[PDB]
RNA sequence: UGUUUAUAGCCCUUGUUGUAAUACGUCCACUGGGGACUGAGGACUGCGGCUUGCCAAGGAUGCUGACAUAAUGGU
């Protein structure tokens, strides 16, 4: 997470505010199609 | 009024169709719908299934619209 990895005259990003910003868990829900009437 | 299938039939017993059907009881790791409430958790770990990636498998996501309002909420 250091500069070494992703080093730039602007960083990755700009700034990093706040906290770690917790990534949700990764969903189990698979798009199927419709059963239709 | 009286008799025993006749110009109606019924009952009892036995065979065949019959290994009949239906009801009831029971089970299916069989299956088709309709409705409601709930979405806690938050990288990855697991147990499974499928065929390495996928999956309904250790708790919701996806696609949209309206309003961006006093709308929802508070008093």
């Not at 250091?2 to 770690?20: F, H, N, S, T």
């Not at 990534?23 to 419709?34: I, L, S, Y």
Request: no cysteine; proline share 11%; hydrophobic share 35%.
């Amino acid at each position: 997470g250091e500069r070494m990895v992703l080093p730039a005259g602007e960083a990755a990003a700009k700034y990093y505010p706040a906290y770690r910003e917790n990534v949700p868990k990764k969903a189990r829900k698979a798009v199927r199609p419709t059963k239709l009437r």
